[model samples]
Target: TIKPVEYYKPDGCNKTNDHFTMQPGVNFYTVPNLGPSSSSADECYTNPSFSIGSSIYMFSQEIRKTDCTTGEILSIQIVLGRIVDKGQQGPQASPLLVWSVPNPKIINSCAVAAGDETGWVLCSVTLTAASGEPIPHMFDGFWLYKFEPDTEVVAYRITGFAYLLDKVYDSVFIGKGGGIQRGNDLYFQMFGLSRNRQSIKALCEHGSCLGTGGGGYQVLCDRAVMSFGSEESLISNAYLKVNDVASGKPTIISQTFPPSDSYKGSNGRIYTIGERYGIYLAPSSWNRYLRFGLTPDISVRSTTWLKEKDPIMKVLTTCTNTDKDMCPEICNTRGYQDIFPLSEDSSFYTYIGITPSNEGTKSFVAVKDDAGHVASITILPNYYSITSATISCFMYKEEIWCIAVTEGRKQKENPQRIYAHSYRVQKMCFN
Candidate 1:
């Protein structure tokens, strides 16, 4: 139940149309990496920093160790740590802590996390069976875990199995930006495709599944085909309803976005991207989102998605589809994975992406609002040739600190490596 630093703007901050037009200033410089180069720190869950006052914690999607001399991925696992501090540059400083999830012995496992907002660190993992087992029970089920981020007490310790949901199949799983604080601990509100991607609803508790049902995931909306057809999956949004434990009734306020999403704030809104980008304001409920963000043009769409519906490096295998409106069996990599909220309540936000052009792909750091398009900055080609990147930011005393990580812009072939660099601009420019 620990709230992050509230969103506040300085005086004369927004004097342009409505509020002042926010922009990134000229003081940008590189901060250091959160861990040593040997940690091989890669992409986290999209835009991965969660702040509590001046402290920040990030969960790593790929933390693999290598030959230190050979650049081979020796061990791969999930890690959560306090990567940045108040006065320092990047995450490697402070009473820093990084620990592997206490996984059960199984063939292979991939972990996901939440809980930087509260002190209770939460992680969920799915694993395959070891070779010796019978085929019927070859899965270790989904492991929902809770921990105290205490490297000072020898190591991190599990308070208990906070969320103990059994994995029935792949669809009944939780990952990435799916964790939230409902009670004093982990109270989950997960929504997804109903087996065949037809209907969608909240999975379980957190005051009877956020807004919709009591038990069993049901249809809350519609898609293409009767009963939404079989063999595909739609609805890829994660809705987190937090701060819901007051005696009267906890507000069902959720910060909607990401898998794929790195930004989270109680702005009372939701977002969508189509032929153009957009937004919606939520007065009090999840389904009550009023379509907003204005009608964007081709140029803004290209900037939002790197290219206008253009596919990036990750290739996808195709499947037959009857309806063009139906969800595809598989999807392409998202052009923009993170959407940054300028303040906790302001409609303006930022995105870090690439813009395709005659020269090549140019880095686009843009700020947008409900009516669309405020101002932007570029982390252009020096060069961002075939690169993928992630940037997370926070506001300190006099400046906003950010860490930028890129894979293609650096050297190749080093055992366990890190490319996380930090930067910042004047806080006044973005108010």
Candidate 2:
């Protein structure tokens, strides 16, 4: 690990300070006639590649000055050129201006350093009055670049240099993914499947059933359980409909999509897995499969879905609610308070999980309110064919608690080991 080195810090405009303000005697000049520099013929035009473990320049920017002193404005001069050789003093290519400003606006901070290999830096500058005396005022400016992979290229030139500078600067200093118009849309495709169909039975409870019946309560089909198997027999099935505990009229929601995979088991039974995003039933032999997506209602939207690439594994590490009656709800708030109590107006959480693409057995949990708004998503770790897994969630003292269990064989052991894990749901509420 690299230790932090003392760069420079200034008290006013002292030359001795590493990061001191400018002295009064320094002359100012702009490189106007300086054309783009050249290198050996082979190095004149080169395309570089990046790797996963490394970072490339995304974008960066700096402010011109700040109000540390007075009257004088500040500017930061930047040089953008490539390093051609080890002995080279500066940029090999014609030094392009990275940042310059006659618009010396006061900024909030003195300096900013933001990056990870491909990162950003924002510095402050000061301008003097016409008499060459130290100007008491300062302004700010910045620069940014992100580590890029081989598949991506710097679109800086394509969008124009000035645009790149402003966009990169705003994205870091202002907010991530900012500086773009609202209409600009970003889309990523996860895995694809033929349009498959699914059905669900959701039990809705309101008021008295939950012990908070103030004569004002609403029921919604936000939470549900679904199933899958290899064939028509429902060979290995859960008994949620045991007739006794299965109370109330069932509200069934059905949907259809592409066909899923199935096969005959060694025990002379046909086994098939459901293709829905909510949950699935798998035999211990089927280890390399998993499913994840938003709730079927929302996942059906053309523009929304879970990310297809990464396997997200997490557990309940934070607890926000304790009042069991807080259930889930959405309400407008005017301000925040310390030691806020968990109530019907407060937010709640749900559990989520994903499996490694290499080992596709995983599950997810989501909690939404009566208005069909989701509160939280928690991801559980994937357990290989090492076992058959089960997941569930509930509301406890000011917290949403979740538990998962998997039954699989231990390494070289005949008896199956029961693996279990639990977590507090990450709370997500609305104002």
List the candidates' TM-scores in order: 0.53, 0.21
lDDT of 2 by residue, 1-431 (tens): 11111112223433332221111111111212122222222111110100100111112222112221231333322223221212322111222234332343432111111123322222222334577553442212222221122322121111122211201111111111111100111111111111113432222221223436633322222111112332222111110100111122211111222112221111100101112112221211211111222232212332122222111221111212122222223221111001101112212213233332433343433443334344334233323323223332233233333333333323332232333334443332222
**TM-score attained by model 1:** 0.53
Q: For residues 64-129, could you state the per-residue lDDT of candidate 1 as single tens digits?
A: 333221232233333344544445433342324455444322212232323443232223233343
* Candidate 1 residue 31 C-alpha distance from true site, Å: 3.2
Write down the lDDT that model 1 would get: 0.33
* Root-mean-square deviation (CA) per prediction: 12.1, 29.1
Candidate 1 off by > 4 Å? 1-3, 13-19, 39-56, 63-95, 102-123, 130-140, 144-169, 177-183, 187-331, 334-336, 344-346, 356-361, 369-371, 383-391, 404-418, 425-431
* Candidate number of the best lDDT: 1
The CA lDDT of each predicted structure is: 0.33, 0.22
